[PDB]
């Protein structure tokens, strides 16, 4: 599993995915946006582990309204997903002083947890 892009690094990490993504057709991946339990969703901040099927990508905590221009790149990091083809979104949220430590874990473990807690999200949501 790769990872690109850079925590609390809306921008950055947006051209990092576009770049590591390139013309990559999606139409049966999974996207799973990983979050924090905030109070509200203008304070959310979002991480990203796409499972295209073939092969798995992971974005830190880089996207939502916490960061600043951060709401702007989710829309944007949706928007491209679904340019390419992605259908299927998932949301799993985690505690606030454990979302580094979840993002740290080995390829596998990471992916088989949040597949376990995720459900499925109407993408518009993150609009």
């Known amino acids: 599993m790769v990872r690109v892009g850079m925590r609390a690094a809306p921008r950055v990490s947006l051209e990092a995915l576009k770049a590591a993504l390139?013309?990559?057709?999606?139409?049966?991946?999974?996207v799973y946006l990983i979050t924090d339990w905030q109070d509200k969703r203008d304070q959310a901040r979002y991480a990203l582990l796409l499972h295209t099927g073939k092969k798995d990508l992971l974005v830190p905590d880089a996207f939502g309204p916490a960061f600043p221009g951060g709401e702007e790149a989710l829309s944007?990091?949706?928007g491209l997903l679904l340019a390419q083809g992605a259908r299927r979104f998932y949301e799993a949220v985690v505690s606030p002083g454990e979302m580094t430590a979840l993002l740290d874990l080995p390829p596998e473990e990471l992916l088989k947890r949040v597949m376990a807690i995720a459900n499925p999200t109407d993408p518009g949501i993150y609009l």
């Open 76 to 78: 944007e990091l949706v």
């Open 22 to 30: 390139g013309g990559l057709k999606l139409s049966e991946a999974k």
